[PDB]
Symmetry: C2
Subunit: 453 residues, 2 copies
């Protein structure tokens, strides 16, 4: 990857010692938290920050975080996109506080549901919506409904996708081109040959061959892959994807949980896509677990004919999906504030300007140092990969990842006051990001890479 791995290891060890010295109270907290949390924090992913323990946060506002050791950071991680529009957005926090004090969960709608339903249809261009407690659940539930409406059992996913804890998606290609369980993800009692057809992104011939079996209920995809580094769609890919799925009467599900970085209507709105289903989680409810999903009228009519509107006196049933706290008053209040006050054209304009600045800086560093790496931007979200050219598909991209180099870069920045999400080589801008914060990122990355070379 253009670096001396011994120099990376040397720097990394020094930065691990620096991390211990700078964050003693977080380290003390980790010793205590390891006594009662299975993985030393409430979520096992939190163990995967670089450094010997996760930081404990004292407070955060906008793009600023302060830890319990008093260290201050500019935050480009933003809750791994859960806080994409910044921490503690005042309209959203105010809406959450107000609604909590007048009922958070009633198993009933409020007036905010009226506003949000109409907003979702206006913004995202599909008429009918539902709310879940996570993007994962939106994907699971849409796939169930697609199986119900179509009578077909298989879902197409793309190699090196991520759609959450959707077990049918947890597959990869092995060296022989066979679909096998994703590395490190147990098959969990699923035989994926019965549930899933796997294809590489940007391969219309392979997609045709998969759909032609006649057993595919849906294609589930990001419109631009973001969970193996960034994989842009090739020229003509979306048009082909849309055409093939129409021809084979296969649902096209577009998951914008990350690609909502592209604009206020997502990638789909910015590029004229025509999804059958649209999924969006992570960032829309101020840090309350939530997602929305939407569908076309044509899909809605097929769903209603296999799951009719409930009749008076009918036997109660969940029908295998929904959730007790899904679509609750608190979620809807937070969503209303987010869509009305936060996810605006002006907000995105600012985010794009700062993200473009960050992208240009990374690119200049990669060019100057002659690294065989590249950087990509989708709106507010910027990521680099350790290969010379943009990947054609997820399988290609996967080879351009490295745990040690990633940990070293991330920790060097962390110890000097910049947080990057540990799961990506990405930076995300929000309305509170300032030009100085981008300059600090840029300088620190350049310093780190220069020390390595």
């Amino acid at each position: 990857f253009g670096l001396d791995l011994a120099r990376v290891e040397t720097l990394f060890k020094r930065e691990l010692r620096r991390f211990d010295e700078l964050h003693p109270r977080s380290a003390q907290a980790y010793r205590e938290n390891r006594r009662h949390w299975l993985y030393g924090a409430p979520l096992h992913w939190m163990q995967q920050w670089p450094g010997n323990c996760p930081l404990l946060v004292k407070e955060a506002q906008g793009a600023r975080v302060t830890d319990i050791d008093g260290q201050q950071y500019v935050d480009f991680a933003l809750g791994d996109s859960g806080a994409m529009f910044g921490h503690a957005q005042p309209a959203v926090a105010d809406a959450i506080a107000r609604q909590a004090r007048r009922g958070s969960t009633l198993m009933l709608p409020t007036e905010d549901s009226l506003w949000v339903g109409a907003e979702l249809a206006r913004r995202f261009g599909l008429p009918y919506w539902q709310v879940t407690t996570s993007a994962t659940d939106a994907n699971r539930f849409v796939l169930r409904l697609c199986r119900m409406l179509s009578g077909r059992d298989k879902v197409v996913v793309f190699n090196c996708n991520y759609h959450g804890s959707v077990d049918e998606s947890q597959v990869e290609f092995d060296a022989a081109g066979r679909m096998v369980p994703r590395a490190g993800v147990h098959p969990n009692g699923v035989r994926h040959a019965t549930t899933t057809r796997l294809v590489e992104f940007n391969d219309l011939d392979a997609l045709e061959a998969a759909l032609a079996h006649g057993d595919v209920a849906a294609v589930l995809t990001e419109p631009f892959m973001t969970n193996v580094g960034m994989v842009p769609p090739a020229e003509g890919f979306h048009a082909g994807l849309r055409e093939l799925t129409r021809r084979h009467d296969v649902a096209l599900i577009i998951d914008e949980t990350h690609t909502i970085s592209c604009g206020p209507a997502g990638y789909s709105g910015a590029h004229g896509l025509e999804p059958d289903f649209f999924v969006l989680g992570k960032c829309i409810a101020g840090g309350i677990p939530s997602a929305v999903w939407g569908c076309s009228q044509a899909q809605a009519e097929r769903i209603w004919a296999v799951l009719p509107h409930f009749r008076p006196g009918q036997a109660i049933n969940h029908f295998g999906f929904g959730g007790t706290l899904a679509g609750n008053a608190l979620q809807l209040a937070a969503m209303r504030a987010t869509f009305a006050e936060v996810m605006t054209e002006d907000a995105y304009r600012h985010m794009f300007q700062l993200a473009a600045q960050l992208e240009a800086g990374v690119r200049a560093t990669l060019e100057e140092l002659r690294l065989p790496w590249h950087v990509t931007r989708i709106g507010a979200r910027v990521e680099y990969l350790f290969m010379t050219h943009a990947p054609r598909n997820g399988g290609e991209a996967h080879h351009a990842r490295n745990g040690l180099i990633e940990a070293c870069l991330h920790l060097y920045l962390l110890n000097r006051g910049v947080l990057l999400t540990p799961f990506h080589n990405m930076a995300l801008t929000c309305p509170a990001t300032r030009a100085e914060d981008v300059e600090l990122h840029d300088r620190l990355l350049r310093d780190c890479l220069g020390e390595l070379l």
Copy 2:
């Protein structure tokens, strides 16, 4: 069932008209919400309230709800248990408001995690914990870990269980005693013979026969069934369940999402159960979607052996579970307030007094009217079933449910100011419930049943 169904239909039709007359603004709202929500509200379950639409809530506090028509209710539904300790509990709402203003989701712990971890271990008597965004997810993720640690693929569940949108649980017995997909729940590409063994509750011989195949990773159960009416465990059943699962090296997962009504440490802490895993969602975070799960020391050691603590520089992986907003700062603040200030001995004592009063009142009415029905209480939660004696198992219980009678009783009460969850024949008390609220329930139920007889 001891009622003439034509008389029930007649009363129900009258109450449907009454509902329309009393709630015109909610009906107007429904017409609009059906344009933008697939099932006319954010969550499709909300269509299953009786009456021609779900009520739109204006505000709620404690056990009091006011709708957008200005109608006032006493609430024994409490968000279908999501608001078990009342609406707008002041310490929990204050904690949510405060935390929203200082960072709600950071992909990092806060100091609240220190207190909450220690509290969960103290309260529930298992040492190690994790947080999810729902009870469903806690169940799914525990089952994945049990498959990983055991190398076995099957889960045992009980007929007419409910554990959330856990696909492997969605089975029932047909008329021949064969395991088939649960009515109204599509198999979703699963062949359940490969994932699931089904037994009736309170049947140790059948349980032994299922475990003896050597292919069961776990038994998943409520300790007292609450989702088909109430099915108490028989004398000696828990002792047998614990012993058989030990003998077969099978994990016992106890789901307390409802049975937390039994007391501050759940049914398990009242009755000396020895769960390998303990799951609790719905009510612990003030209406923020959340759940916890805990495991024994012995299970922790087996999990760490298959999924070791993350190492610096290791390649990132979710391993198939967790979620982006799981274990977040906002959830932890709400849980801390709940466990510290809300789920107290005094709260439970109040809840039990009012629930015992409600139970005794229902029973007096059933006995006076000579209905072939019975009522059961587990702590704060009271439910009747349309059969003379407590059911021995879920299959028996399922025959003593009836959509039309249930809708009629629920609507009669709703139109006269008492909310009951539409999915059960249950009433739940909270610290804000008042004696007069119980008296109103008692009188209205007696009036309804008297009109029918």
